[PDB]
Design a protein around this ligand. Structure first.
Ligand code: NA
Ligand code: NA
Length: 190
């Protein structure tokens, strides 16, 4: 169903839906690993389904329709603890590339495309443990797609070889994120 911000479990999958207080976002959980989101001139929001906790070797499948009208991402997204890391494996995005506000460490050729690897430091920002300073890791897919499989180990291992350490996994989802834009998306995760 259409729900408010929060986390929980639906039809066998963990879900997280968060936003910054700006309206215009409707997030809806569907059967199995499906969710859909429709946003009209939202602020920043992140919503999707997956697992709690994630793993460092999960092969994640996703498929659906993704129609962003502005700044938005479709990613495998999650966190670790000790160290506290927020990470992204971006499979598709709108008008804004993550490369802008991050620093490139290398590349990895995975699941049919080269991805550029970046790290950014979030200073005194919101997190799964409250206001904190922590690193963000990115793999950004050069060839955007709306379906396929992501072997997360390819990215975690590549990040490790570049000196990017991951802690013990917290949640791991396929998420649609928007940032002051509009759009629609419907995705099934497994
Ligand atoms: Na795109
Ligand atoms: Na801040």
């Amino acid at each position: 169903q259409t729900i408010q911000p929060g986390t929980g479990y639906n039809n066998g999958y963990f879900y997280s839906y968060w936003n910054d207080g700006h309206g215009g976002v409707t997030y809806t959980n569907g059967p199995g690993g499906q969710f859909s989101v429709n946003w009209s001139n939202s602020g920043n929001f992140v919503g999707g389904k997956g697992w709690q906790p994630g793993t460092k070797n999960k092969v994640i499948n996703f498929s659906g329709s993704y129609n962003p009208n502005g700044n938005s991402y479709l990613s495998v997204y999650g966190w670790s603890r000790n160290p506290l890391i927020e990470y992204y494996i971006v499979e598709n995005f709108g008008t804004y590339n993550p490369s802008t506000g991050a620093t490139k460490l290398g590349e990895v050729t995975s699941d049919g495309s080269v991805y550029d690897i970046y790290r950014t430091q979030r200073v005194n920002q919101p997190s799964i443990i409250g206001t904190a300073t922590f690193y963000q890791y990115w793999s950004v897919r050069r060839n955007h797609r709306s379906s396929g499989s992501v072997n997360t180990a390819n990215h975690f291992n590549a990040w490790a070889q570049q000196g990017l350490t991951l802690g013990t996994m917290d949640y791991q989802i396929v998420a649609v994120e928007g940032y002051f834009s509009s759009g629609s998306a419907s995705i099934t995760v497994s």
